[PDB]
Amino acid sequence: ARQTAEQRQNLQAFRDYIKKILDPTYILSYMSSWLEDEEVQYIQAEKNNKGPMEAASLFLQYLLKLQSEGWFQAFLDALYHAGYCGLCEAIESWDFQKIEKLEEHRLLLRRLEPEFKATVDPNDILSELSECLINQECEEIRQIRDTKGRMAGAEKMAECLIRSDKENWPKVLQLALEKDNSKFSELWIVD
Amino acid sequence: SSARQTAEQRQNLQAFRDYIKKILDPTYILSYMSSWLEDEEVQYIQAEKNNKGPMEAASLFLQYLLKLQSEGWFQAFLDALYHAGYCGLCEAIESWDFQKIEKLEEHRLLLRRLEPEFKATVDPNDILSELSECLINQECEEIRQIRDTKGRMAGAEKMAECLIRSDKENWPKVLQLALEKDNSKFSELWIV
Amino acid sequence: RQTAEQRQNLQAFRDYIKKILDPTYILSYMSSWLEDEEVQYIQAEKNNKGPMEAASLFLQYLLKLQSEGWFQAFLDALYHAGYCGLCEAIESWDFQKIEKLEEHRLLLRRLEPEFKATVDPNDILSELSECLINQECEEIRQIRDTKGRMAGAEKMAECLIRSDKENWPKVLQLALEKDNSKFSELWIV
Amino acid sequence: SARQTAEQRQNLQAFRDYIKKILDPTYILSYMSSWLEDEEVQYIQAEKNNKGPMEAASLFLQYLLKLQSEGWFQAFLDALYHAGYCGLCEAIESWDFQKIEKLEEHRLLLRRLEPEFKATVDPNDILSELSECLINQECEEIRQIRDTKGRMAGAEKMAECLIRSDKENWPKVLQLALEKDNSKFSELWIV
Numbered sequence: 147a148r149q150t151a152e153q154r155q156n157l158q159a160f161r162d163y164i165k166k167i168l169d170p171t172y173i174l175s176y177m178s179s180w181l182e183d184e185e186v187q188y189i190q191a192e193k194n195n196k197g198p199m200e201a202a203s204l205f206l207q208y209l210l211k212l213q214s215e216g217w218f219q220a221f222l223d224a225l226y227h228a229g230y231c232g233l234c235e236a237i238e239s240w241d242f243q244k245i246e247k248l249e250e251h252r253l254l255l256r257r258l259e260p261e262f263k264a265t266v267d268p269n270d271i272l273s274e275l276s277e278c279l280i281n282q283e284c285e286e287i288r289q290i291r292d293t294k295g296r297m298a299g300a301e302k303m304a305e306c307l308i309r310s311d312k313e314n315w316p317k318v319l320q321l322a323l324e325k326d327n328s329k330f331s332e333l334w335i336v337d
Numbered sequence: 338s339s340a341r342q343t344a345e346q347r348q349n350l351q352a353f354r355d356y357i358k359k360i361l362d363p364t365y366i367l368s369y370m371s372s373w374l375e376d377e378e379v380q381y382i383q384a385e386k387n388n389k390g391p392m393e394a395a396s397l398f399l400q401y402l403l404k405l406q407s408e409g410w411f412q413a414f415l416d417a418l419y420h421a422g423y424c425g426l427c428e429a430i431e432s433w434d435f436q437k438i439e440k441l442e443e444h445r446l447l448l449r450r451l452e453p454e455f456k457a458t459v460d461p462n463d464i465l466s467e468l469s470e471c472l473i474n475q476e477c478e479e480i481r482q483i484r485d486t487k488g489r490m491a492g493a494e495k496m497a498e499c500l501i502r503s504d505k506e507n508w509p510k511v512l513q514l515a516l517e518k519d520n521s522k523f524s525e526l527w528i529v
Numbered sequence: 530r531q532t533a534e535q536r537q538n539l540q541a542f543r544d545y546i547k548k549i550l551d552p553t554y555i556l557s558y559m560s561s562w563l564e565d566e567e568v569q570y571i572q573a574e575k576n577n578k579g580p581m582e583a584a585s586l587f588l589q590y591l592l593k594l595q596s597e598g599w600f601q602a603f604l605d606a607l608y609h610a611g612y613c614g615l616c617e618a619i620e621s622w623d624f625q626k627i628e629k630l631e632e633h634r635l636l637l638r639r640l641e642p643e644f645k646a647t648v649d650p651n652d653i654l655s656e657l658s659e660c661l662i663n664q665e666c667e668e669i670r671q672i673r674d675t676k677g678r679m680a681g682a683e684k685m686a687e688c689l690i691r692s693d694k695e696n697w698p699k700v701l702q703l704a705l706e707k708d709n710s711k712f713s714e715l716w717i718v
Numbered sequence: 719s720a721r722q723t724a725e726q727r728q729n730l731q732a733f734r735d736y737i738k739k740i741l742d743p744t745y746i747l748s749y750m751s752s753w754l755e756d757e758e759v760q761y762i763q764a765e766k767n768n769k770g771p772m773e774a775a776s777l778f779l780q781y782l783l784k785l786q787s788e789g790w791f792q793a794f795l796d797a798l799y800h801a802g803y804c805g806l807c808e809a810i811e812s813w814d815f816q817k818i819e820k821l822e823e824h825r826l827l828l829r830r831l832e833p834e835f836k837a838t839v840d841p842n843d844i845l846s847e848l849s850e851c852l853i854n855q856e857c858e859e860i861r862q863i864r865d866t867k868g869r870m871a872g873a874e875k876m877a878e879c880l881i882r883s884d885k886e887n888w889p890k891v892l893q894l895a896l897e898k899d900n901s902k903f904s905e906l907w908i909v
């Protein structure tokens with residue numbers, strides 16, 4: 147049970163990468179047997195009241211105090227089956243290089259988000275990008291597009307890509323933008 | 338509501354505290370809370386629901402309820418539960434018999450564990466109408482709002498969480514029947 | 530004086546009101562009595578939780594007002610929005626006509642699946658318009674025209690269940706019979 | 719310089735009530751996401767969804783008044799302008815809200831007439847004539863509501879956006895559009 151101590155120290159070290167990717171509300175269905183119903187609802191309420199990142203921070207607070215045998219592997223499995231293969235792979239090997247290399251394109255898309263909202267319609271490329279987002283994120287993007295309009299939906303799409311753990315989502319996005327012939331492709335340089 | 342009757346009413350509430358806090362959202366009996374509780378205590382209970390969730394709000398509501406002394410607080414509580422829709426929970430408290438609510442535990446755990454498969458194969462728009470009498474009236478309304486603002490998986494998860502907290506003795510069977518009408522991949526996983 | 534008495538009756542009957550009233554339909558009449566934040570909080574509650582939770586929040590605010598004439602503004606707003614039945618009940622504090630509808634609220638709740646399968650709102654919406662708020666009829670038509678018959682049929686069923694019109698069950702029977710629909714055989718009043 | 723920061727904070731605090739009646743911060747967050755913490759950005763978005771624009775703007779100002787990085791104020795002005803808040807930008811930049819105060823009379827009149835507006839105006843008829851007075855994303859949300867919930871729902875959303883418009887002449891543009899459509903509401907809206 148020194149492995150656990152080493153596992154706890156590393157999570158705190160990499161909490162800034164984790165909270166930038168993980169929306170814990172998406173992996174609570176795979177971890178419900180490890181958390182109290184009250185803890186599940188507190189994490190869910192924190193997401194609705196403050197956002198994904200603070201919800202992830204609270205989820206880690208609970209995660210770092212668990213003691214049952216195998217709590218860490220349960221987290222890895224929950225991440226994987228929810229769709230966080232990239233984040234799961236990074237945590238399992240404590241190597242965030244593939245996620246660090248994405249920082250440049252996280253900064254670029256966030257800086258260019260106004261042009262993104264002005265020139266991209268999520269209804270045109272969401273299917274091509276469904277391998278870079280959690281299935282529920284794609285569902286929320288379509289509902290927002292259907293209730294609030296194109297610009298509102300495009301912003302949700304941009305925010306979801308920024309938190310994607312797929313090492314090549316910038317290239318996936320470039321290909322989708324070119325297939326639809328979008329003014330934004332001229333602003334998106336991958337290779 | 339003498340001294341020997343409050344003690345029995347208090348003893349009964351604590352005896353079933355885990356059954357109550359797993360079913361009751363005190364936000365739904367707010368007209369009872371405001372006429373029997375201090376206004377400040379009501380707002381703390383409301384803050385607890387918004388900030389922590391229904392279960393923590395129910396736990397806090399019970400703390401206040403167990404300290405009341407006013408005449409008729411217990412029977413008023415039962416009356417509130419019934420008119421809110423908590424017929425099963427109200428019927429259980431009056432007769433100290435939670436057998437019908439205990440038989441549901443088997444299906445509460447099953448749906449909780451199978452929640453990923455539920456969200457993946459079920460659309461509340463297909464079964465919400467069939468399941469209305471198993472949920473509180475406000476729960477049906479929030480399920481549709483979530484379904485329309487966040488999508489199918491989000492609405493399905495809220496529905497599953499509301500079924501888990503249902504006190505209707507036969508909601509597992511009603512759910513199975515609705516699932517069969519649509520011929521859904523989840524029916525093979527839901528045995529009653 | 531009468532404010533204090535009117536305040537006490539609202540709390541007594543709040544649960545009947547929030548079963549009928551969607552405050553989103555009377556906020557255009559009441560914005561001068563509520564802070565802008567309170568108006569928008571009620572609107573967000575409607576979008577996030579539904580009419581009933583929005584009505585509960587509106588009543589909490591309404592029960593703390595003190596300005597002169599807030600109650601009379603509420604009655605008039607109910608009328609101009611279309612809540613004639615609910616307005617008539619509040620003026621006399623007699624909810625017998627709305628209580629008597631509970632039997633048919635439960636029946637239409639039971640039969641909503643059969644309703645969605647056999648009823649087209651485009652056929653009876655006009656006959657039932659005086660049982661619904663005008664804005665509800667518009668949303669039923671938008672749903673019917675964008676999402677299909679069942680979606681509009683479900684929206685209609687949910688709106689009738691919340692109707693304060695004392696004779697909407699009989700109006701529904703007659704309209705369904707006028708069109709000769711398979712659901713009329715299950716709807717007898 | 720700290721002097722300019724200090725003076726800019728006092729003036730923002732001085733006008734916080736004019737700002738929070740016009741500014742929906744969700745519309746200028748894409749231009750300022752680089753100046754706020756990810757947590758602060760998402761909390762502002764949750765506040766909009768949970769409480770509305772005014773509470774979101776009030777929360778946004780609390781964060782704005784604690785910034786210290788070089789150029790945060792000019793970034794705020796740039797975000798406002800390019801989002802479409804030219805009038806509010808002109809008012810904040812020059813500390814003159816005369817044009818926005820002069821609108822108070824017509825904000826009150828339209829709000830009072832909101833029932834008559836919803837009953838006689840269809841956004842499909844005047845939205846194009848009025849798009850100059852509204853944020854581009856507001857026009858998209860008006861059409862989505864108009865197309866999913868109907869005319870009265872869209873008409874009320876339209877009035878709410880006009881009420882928060884920072885264009886000094888939106889009352890006159892509305893009158894002209896209502897006359898072009900020959901609308902029952904024109905008899906109630908002059909000047």
Ligand SMILES: [Cl-]
Binds near residue numbers: 543544588
């Ligand atoms: Cl209430």
Ligand SMILES: [Cl-]
Binds near residue numbers: 855
């Ligand atoms: Cl536009």
Ligand SMILES: [Cl-]
Binds near residue numbers: 887890891894
């Ligand atoms: Cl002009």
